[PDB]
């Protein structure tokens, strides 16, 4: 609990950096700025006011425009949302990073803006911390094809991918041009400074219209690794399929829960006439699928369960030579024989005592 | 790990970029990547090497791109747009260097920034003798009719290969060949080759004719002796080319499938059940030759071409036509084993000859199974 | 020396000198003449390709030629990324007349956009029907009072020709009071030479004269034809237009890219969305009169021969098809080809015993169709 050392009479972007310094000195996870209200910081679950002035819609608009460009205000007034990234160096020391989100709300009967900065770590966690089977590590760096991390949002998939990239990039003799396309650019790799790799990070609302546009653009840049934050629609899926067929590792995430179910989503994304071709493409290209789920622990902290299949040459052949109409079933069997089920990982964790009995039984019930 | 340019400026200016480029070519770079907050990189033989020790500034890069494209280029990047263009320049020698350039906006250290990428554009088809090709391929490379597939990953030099084939069929006297090629982006041209009795028409598919398939269908209207289709991805183009071959025209195409048997599987599966059997017979009858090509590092730190090929003799084709169509893939495997040449076999031969590294050999063996 | 130079080669090539050069090429018995930017004019005589000029033509010359053949805006059309197909006739000093299919396509020469034109010689007159070697069934079925006749098959199966022959038969005979309207896109066959009494033939080219094949048919409905020729019916639009024309009571003749009578049926029925498609299907069944799928297969003589699988849609066939379940029309049709029609395989067999096709080829046909 503190107050800002030198609050300005009016808040200008220059002062926002100082305010952020103050918040970090307090160890704030999050900083919330709203028009009708003082600046708030959340330290350790408690919300504290870090300024004794209520800001103004003009001030907030200025802040957001500085952070995300001249048209940010107009974008908010159009009825859109802003997600971006903000970073600063206080004085040639360490650097401060943030995921920033501006949204329109209604304050005192008038349109206004609310901007939220969430502290994001500087470097992706190492892969060893992720606690991954050896199978996955062997499957994690294919020459070509698609790697999918699936699960409901807040499963920490972005973190995982970020980590893989770090691993793939940091090592010597990894001559990899990496191109990522991210809605919000969660992670940066400037600190890692690998010997023979480059990472170019393009933010989708700011730098390039679309995720699909992004990938198709990557095809023109001769990357060795392509990161697409999400592939929700069939355009992005098709772009990524071309990139993979072209011969480039593609890494993406999906909202689907379950490797077989994931397959079903991929195949159905396309109309009937396209769907057979599209399916052959997908089966050919896929290399690895992981569905991650964050579940509460006995310690009241979160743990990652994971159901994965590695799509070996053998698996891929099985799927391609078989009747396509039932890929979904086939994959379901294959995860059982060559992969790892969500229920199985849940049981392992339960025997380890990491998860509660009730949670385990829940997972078993859902998987049924 | 890092081969530096000779005369590195304090701040990088378009004049120097030209100098920087010649150097990269001297190193035999395919691609040059310039990014803010990073040194200039060149890809030589799949390895990335830094061409300078100095990290370029955003302003420098903006200047470069403005020079290559236009004054408004930086703004356009600020727009949230992508730049694709080309850059040519005339060295000391005068014979020009040219590149496909692409500038895209990214975020570097919290600030908007630019990345430019320059990709070398080959011009002149190799000679076929330089390709190092078995004789049984050379005998089979000029069928009267049917389809010749060069398959492999992008950047395996299949474009170069078929360019070389075309050169060979064009430059020989008494080769009365009207050649029509349809390619995504035209890379190889045949104006420099002198011909006595051949014509080559090159149509670019985004610019000149909407589809590859359209392109082929157009070729039929042009009545040439040889048809080149850059890629044959979907069942449309495959069907077009099947009609072209059934009519009586050599068709040459590429696929991204890895393996003769696998390529077969892709071709056959392209088609739904009711069309599927007919289409399959068509394919089997029309096929004349399949080469899957793979570029693999050598002892002297360069690259070499391994090839797994089958020549589809009349006998082979009969074998395939007699059999169960669902067993077409397997039968094809057997046929590459008996009458063709496997990727693994080529890898072994190269290893015994000392061209490929032991490690590399092992790696190759791993993949095929 | 594989060069046969043009008698009076101009300093720059202009359309008239194109006519003269064409004369020269005919004198050499050239099948095809290809003109390209940055290249001399070539003519193909039999196997051989021979340059007819020492000068390589400039892009502007070519553009002028094509504009002369196909309208001021031909160049711009090429630059759009489109492809030009048309037809070019010219009359020597002789009363005789020269006809070609012309095709112009855009290509890249020396790094610049350029043009390639190709003229392929066309005969003056459709073959006779008797030359076509058609069963008597088909000849009886070839001139219905109303309904649709489909000639289907892959490109290069000579369906266009066969159509031209039918039309020639129907216009040549006396007391055949037929106004014939064709919508051919590239017009390949002309009927000027036949010039018979009691028939008129109006041939409209689809790129040049009328936007679309469907537009073309709908236009024919306004002209009181007795016979309508549509080059192709890919669209549901064109199919619907032709269905209206047939329902009104006009013979319609078209081609399809599909292989097999049953398959052709499948395509026709599937063209239409679900709410429309049952009605659509009744219409189709009622209207159809004849389906011929044609395939050109090599002969022992190293020429080609035409195999045909046809069904004639008699009143009774049509009844069978209408009375049964709409959704399985394709299968019922499949059986009806077997029972009342003629299969590709059977024709292949008859040809083989006759010794027209080789064992291998016939063997192949059995393999594909049998499926």
Author numbering:
A (entry chain D): 6 to 373
B (entry chain C): 5 to 373
C (entry chain B): 4 to 374
Provide passages from the article that reported this PDB entry:
The dot/icm T4bS system of L. pneumophila is powered by two ATPases: The membrane protein DotL, which is part of the coupling sub‐complex responsible for the recruitment of substrates and their delivery to the secretion channel and DotB, potentially involved in complex assembly and secretion. Here we present the X‐ray crystal structures of two DotB proteins, one from the dot/icm system encoded by the L. pneumophila genome (termed DotBL), at 3.19 Å resolution, and one from the dot/icm system encoded in the plasmid of Y. pseudotuberculosis IP31758 (termed DotBY), at 2.75 Å resolution. DotBL and DotBY subunits display a very similar topology. The main part of the CTD adopts a RecA fold and harbours the signature motifs of the AAA+ family: The Walker A motif between β7 and α5 (also referred as P‐loop), the Asp Box on β8, the Walker B motif on β10 and the His Box on β11.
For the DotBL structure, two identical hexamers could be built, on top of each other, while only one is present in DotBY. In the hexamer, subunits A, C, and E adopt the α conformation, and subunits B, D, and F the β conformation, yielding an overall threefold symmetry [Fig. 2(C)]. DotBL was crystallized in the presence of AMP–PNP and ATPase activity assays using DotBL preincubated with increasing concentrations of AMP‐PNP show that the analogue binds and competes with ATP resulting in an inhibition of phosphate release. Yet, we could observe density for only phosphate not AMP–PNP. The phosphate is clamped by the main chain NH groups between residues 158 and 163 (TGSGKS) and by the Lys162 side chain. In the vicinity of this binding site (less than 6 Å away), the side chains of Glu191 (Asp box), Glu235 (Walker B) and His260 (His box), together with Arg221 (in α6) from the next subunit, point towards the ligand. In the α‐subunits, the binding site is highly similar, except for n + 1 Arg221, which is further from the binding site due to the alternate conformation of the n + 1 subunit [Fig. 4(D)]. Overall, we concluded that disruption of this interface by mutating those two arginines leads to disruption of the hexamer.
